[PDB]
Protein backbone atom coordinates (compact mmCIF):
# COMPACT_ATOMS: atom_id res chain seq x y z
CA UNK A 1 0.00 0.00 0.00
CA UNK A 2 1.74 3.11 -1.37
CA UNK A 3 0.60 6.78 -0.74
CA UNK A 4 0.07 7.77 -4.45
CA UNK A 5 1.20 7.38 -8.09
CA UNK A 6 4.56 9.08 -7.40
CA UNK A 7 6.30 5.96 -6.11
Amino acid sequence: HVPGGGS
Epitope: H1, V2, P3, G4, G5, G6, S7
Partner: antibody, heavy 119, light 113 residues
Framework: VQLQQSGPELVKPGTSVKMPCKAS????????ISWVKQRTGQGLEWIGE????????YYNEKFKGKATLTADKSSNTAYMQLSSVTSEDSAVYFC?????????????WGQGTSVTVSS | DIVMSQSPSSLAVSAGEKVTMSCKSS????????????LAWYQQKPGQSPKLLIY???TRESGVPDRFTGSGSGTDFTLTISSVQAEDLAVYYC????????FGGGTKLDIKR
Protein backbone atom coordinates in the same frame (compact mmCIF):
# COMPACT_ATOMS: atom_id res chain seq x y z
CA VAL B 1 -20.27 -1.67 -9.20
CA GLN B 2 -21.92 0.09 -6.25
CA LEU B 3 -21.06 1.73 -2.92
CA GLN B 4 -23.88 1.84 -0.42
CA GLN B 5 -23.70 4.28 2.52
CA SER B 6 -25.98 4.49 5.59
CA GLY B 7 -28.86 6.93 5.85
CA PRO B 8 -28.68 10.41 7.47
CA GLU B 9 -27.43 10.54 11.05
CA LEU B 10 -27.99 12.87 14.00
CA VAL B 11 -25.26 12.59 16.70
CA LYS B 12 -24.55 14.46 19.97
CA PRO B 13 -21.46 16.68 20.60
CA GLY B 14 -18.59 14.81 22.28
CA THR B 15 -19.85 11.36 21.10
CA SER B 16 -18.89 9.11 18.20
CA VAL B 17 -20.42 8.19 14.90
CA LYS B 18 -19.46 5.22 12.82
CA MET B 19 -20.78 5.08 9.26
CA PRO B 20 -20.46 2.20 6.75
CA CYS B 21 -19.79 1.96 3.06
CA LYS B 22 -20.95 -1.46 1.81
CA ALA B 23 -19.15 -2.35 -1.46
CA SER B 24 -20.36 -4.48 -4.36
CA UNK B 25 -19.94 -5.23 -8.07
CA UNK B 26 -16.16 -5.56 -7.78
CA UNK B 27 -13.25 -7.23 -6.07
CA UNK B 28 -13.19 -5.43 -2.68
CA UNK B 29 -9.56 -6.29 -2.00
CA UNK B 30 -8.25 -5.03 -5.41
CA UNK B 31 -9.07 -1.32 -4.85
CA UNK B 32 -8.75 1.30 -2.08
CA ILE B 33 -11.69 2.98 -0.43
CA SER B 34 -11.10 6.68 0.07
CA TRP B 35 -13.33 8.97 2.14
CA VAL B 36 -14.32 12.60 1.45
CA LYS B 37 -15.96 15.33 3.54
CA GLN B 38 -18.20 18.12 2.21
CA ARG B 39 -19.60 20.89 4.46
CA THR B 40 -22.78 22.78 3.54
CA GLY B 41 -21.84 25.06 0.65
CA GLN B 42 -18.10 24.19 0.90
CA GLY B 43 -15.65 22.32 -1.31
CA LEU B 44 -14.66 18.66 -1.14
CA GLU B 45 -12.10 17.70 1.53
CA TRP B 46 -10.15 14.43 1.57
CA ILE B 47 -10.07 12.58 4.91
CA GLY B 48 -7.96 9.53 4.02
CA GLU B 49 -7.89 6.07 2.48
CA UNK B 50 -7.83 2.39 3.44
CA UNK B 51 -6.50 -0.55 1.38
CA UNK B 52 -8.72 -3.44 2.33
CA UNK B 53 -6.37 -6.24 1.20
CA UNK B 54 -3.95 -5.28 3.95
CA UNK B 55 -6.01 -2.93 6.24
CA UNK B 56 -3.36 -0.18 5.89
CA UNK B 57 -4.38 3.49 5.94
CA TYR B 58 -3.39 7.07 5.05
CA TYR B 59 -4.72 10.32 6.45
CA ASN B 60 -4.94 13.98 5.58
CA GLU B 61 -3.06 15.66 8.46
CA LYS B 62 -6.29 17.49 9.14
CA PHE B 63 -8.12 14.32 10.23
CA LYS B 64 -5.51 12.42 12.23
CA GLY B 65 -6.97 11.34 15.62
CA LYS B 66 -10.45 12.40 14.49
CA ALA B 67 -11.20 9.91 11.78
CA THR B 68 -10.58 6.15 12.14
CA LEU B 69 -10.83 4.21 8.89
CA THR B 70 -11.62 0.49 9.21
CA ALA B 71 -12.71 -2.28 6.87
CA ASP B 72 -14.30 -5.72 6.79
CA LYS B 73 -13.23 -8.15 4.07
CA SER B 74 -15.85 -10.74 4.92
CA SER B 75 -18.83 -8.39 4.35
CA ASN B 76 -17.13 -6.02 1.85
CA THR B 77 -17.78 -3.07 4.10
CA ALA B 78 -15.59 -0.13 4.94
CA TYR B 79 -16.29 2.01 7.97
CA MET B 80 -15.38 5.51 9.06
CA GLN B 81 -15.57 6.46 12.68
CA LEU B 82 -15.48 10.02 13.92
CA SER B 83 -14.71 10.55 17.65
CA SER B 84 -15.25 13.46 20.10
CA VAL B 85 -17.41 15.22 17.49
CA THR B 86 -18.20 18.94 17.26
CA SER B 87 -20.25 21.26 15.00
CA GLU B 88 -17.16 21.30 12.74
CA ASP B 89 -17.80 17.65 11.82
CA SER B 90 -21.39 18.29 10.70
CA ALA B 91 -21.09 17.55 6.95
CA VAL B 92 -21.84 15.08 4.12
CA TYR B 93 -19.28 12.29 4.04
CA PHE B 94 -18.66 10.28 0.87
CA CYS B 95 -16.88 6.98 0.47
CA UNK B 96 -15.33 6.40 -2.95
CA UNK B 97 -13.52 3.60 -4.73
CA UNK B 98 -10.03 4.70 -5.67
CA UNK B 99 -8.25 2.74 -8.43
CA UNK B 100 -4.98 2.59 -6.60
CA UNK B 101 -2.30 1.33 -8.95
CA UNK B 102 -2.90 3.39 -12.06
CA UNK B 103 -5.70 5.96 -12.31
CA UNK B 104 -5.33 6.84 -8.63
CA UNK B 105 -8.71 8.37 -9.30
CA UNK B 106 -12.06 8.01 -7.56
CA UNK B 107 -14.18 6.43 -10.34
CA UNK B 108 -17.14 5.54 -8.13
CA TRP B 109 -18.68 7.42 -5.21
CA GLY B 110 -21.31 6.53 -2.58
CA GLN B 111 -24.48 8.55 -2.04
CA GLY B 112 -22.83 10.19 0.97
CA THR B 113 -23.91 10.06 4.61
CA SER B 114 -25.27 13.38 5.89
CA VAL B 115 -24.13 13.72 9.50
CA THR B 116 -25.52 16.47 11.75
CA VAL B 117 -23.78 17.09 15.11
CA SER B 118 -26.18 18.72 17.59
CA SER B 119 -27.80 17.94 20.94
CA ASP C 1 1.45 18.51 2.11
CA ILE C 2 0.68 19.52 -1.51
CA VAL C 3 -1.79 22.36 -2.17
CA MET C 4 -4.16 22.71 -5.15
CA SER C 5 -5.25 26.06 -6.62
CA GLN C 6 -8.13 26.54 -9.03
CA SER C 7 -9.14 29.60 -10.99
CA PRO C 8 -11.42 31.19 -11.81
CA SER C 9 -13.54 30.56 -8.72
CA SER C 10 -16.65 31.05 -10.84
CA LEU C 11 -17.58 30.95 -14.53
CA ALA C 12 -20.58 31.70 -16.74
CA VAL C 13 -21.16 30.96 -20.44
CA SER C 14 -24.04 30.50 -22.86
CA ALA C 15 -25.05 27.11 -24.23
CA GLY C 16 -22.74 26.20 -27.15
CA GLU C 17 -19.84 28.48 -26.11
CA LYS C 18 -16.45 27.15 -25.18
CA VAL C 19 -15.09 27.39 -21.63
CA THR C 20 -11.66 26.93 -20.06
CA MET C 21 -10.55 26.66 -16.42
CA SER C 22 -7.21 26.27 -14.73
CA CYS C 23 -5.70 24.17 -11.90
CA LYS C 24 -2.22 24.64 -10.42
CA SER C 25 -0.23 22.41 -8.05
CA SER C 26 2.33 23.63 -5.58
CA UNK C 27 4.71 20.91 -6.95
CA UNK C 28 5.23 18.59 -9.91
CA UNK C 29 2.59 15.87 -10.39
CA UNK C 30 4.70 13.93 -12.98
CA UNK C 31 6.51 10.65 -12.38
CA UNK C 32 8.80 7.74 -13.32
CA UNK C 33 5.46 5.86 -13.68
CA UNK C 34 5.27 6.34 -17.38
CA UNK C 35 4.50 9.81 -18.67
CA UNK C 36 1.85 9.93 -15.95
CA UNK C 37 0.78 13.08 -14.17
CA UNK C 38 -1.35 12.01 -11.20
CA LEU C 39 -4.07 14.63 -11.52
CA ALA C 40 -7.82 14.20 -11.94
CA TRP C 41 -10.91 16.31 -12.71
CA TYR C 42 -14.30 15.83 -10.96
CA GLN C 43 -17.78 17.18 -11.73
CA GLN C 44 -20.48 17.88 -9.12
CA LYS C 45 -24.03 18.74 -10.19
CA PRO C 46 -26.29 20.24 -7.51
CA GLY C 47 -27.50 17.61 -4.97
CA GLN C 48 -25.45 14.89 -6.66
CA SER C 49 -22.36 13.03 -5.68
CA PRO C 50 -19.15 13.76 -7.52
CA LYS C 51 -18.26 12.20 -10.85
CA LEU C 52 -14.78 11.42 -12.13
CA LEU C 53 -14.27 13.03 -15.56
CA ILE C 54 -10.57 12.93 -16.27
CA TYR C 55 -7.58 11.06 -14.85
CA UNK C 56 -3.88 11.11 -15.79
CA UNK C 57 -4.24 14.87 -16.59
CA UNK C 58 -5.75 14.11 -20.03
CA THR C 59 -7.56 10.68 -20.13
CA ARG C 60 -11.39 10.57 -20.36
CA GLU C 61 -13.06 8.22 -17.86
CA SER C 62 -15.62 5.91 -19.49
CA GLY C 63 -19.08 7.43 -19.96
CA VAL C 64 -17.70 10.98 -19.94
CA PRO C 65 -18.47 12.85 -23.24
CA ASP C 66 -15.64 14.05 -25.49
CA ARG C 67 -16.50 17.72 -25.19
CA PHE C 68 -14.70 17.48 -21.81
CA THR C 69 -10.92 17.69 -22.39
CA GLY C 70 -8.27 17.95 -19.69
CA SER C 71 -4.68 19.03 -20.40
CA GLY C 72 -1.46 20.39 -18.88
CA SER C 73 1.67 18.95 -17.28
CA GLY C 74 3.89 19.21 -14.18
CA THR C 75 2.20 21.95 -12.10
CA ASP C 76 -0.18 23.55 -14.61
CA PHE C 77 -3.43 21.86 -15.78
CA THR C 78 -6.57 22.80 -17.71
CA LEU C 79 -10.07 21.54 -18.25
CA THR C 80 -11.74 22.68 -21.43
CA ILE C 81 -15.39 22.24 -22.22
CA SER C 82 -16.28 22.84 -25.86
CA SER C 83 -19.98 23.38 -26.67
CA VAL C 84 -21.10 23.87 -23.06
CA GLN C 85 -24.61 22.34 -22.39
CA ALA C 86 -27.27 23.35 -19.83
CA GLU C 87 -26.61 20.01 -18.22
CA ASP C 88 -22.90 20.94 -17.55
CA LEU C 89 -24.07 23.16 -14.75
CA ALA C 90 -21.79 21.99 -12.00
CA VAL C 91 -18.76 22.64 -9.83
CA TYR C 92 -15.57 21.22 -11.26
CA TYR C 93 -12.80 20.25 -8.88
CA CYS C 94 -9.28 19.22 -9.80
CA UNK C 95 -7.45 16.62 -7.64
CA UNK C 96 -3.87 15.58 -7.02
CA UNK C 97 -3.07 11.93 -6.42
CA UNK C 98 0.72 12.16 -6.84
CA UNK C 99 1.11 12.16 -3.04
CA UNK C 100 -1.81 11.37 -0.74
CA UNK C 101 -4.74 13.42 -2.16
CA UNK C 102 -5.70 17.11 -2.38
CA PHE C 103 -8.64 18.68 -4.10
CA GLY C 104 -8.88 22.03 -5.66
CA GLY C 105 -11.40 24.49 -4.17
CA GLY C 106 -13.48 24.19 -7.32
CA THR C 107 -14.53 26.25 -10.31
CA LYS C 108 -18.33 26.85 -10.31
CA LEU C 109 -19.90 26.73 -13.78
CA ASP C 110 -23.06 28.85 -14.36
CA ILE C 111 -25.08 28.93 -17.60
CA LYS C 112 -26.23 32.09 -19.32
CA ARG C 113 -29.45 31.89 -21.29
Amino acid sequence: VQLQQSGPELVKPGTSVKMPCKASGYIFTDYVISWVKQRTGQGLEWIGEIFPRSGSTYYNEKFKGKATLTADKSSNTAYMQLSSVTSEDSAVYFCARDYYGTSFAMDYWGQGTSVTVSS
Amino acid sequence: DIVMSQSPSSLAVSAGEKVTMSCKSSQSLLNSRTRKNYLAWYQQKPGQSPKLLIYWASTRESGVPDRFTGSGSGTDFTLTISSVQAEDLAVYYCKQSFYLRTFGGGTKLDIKR
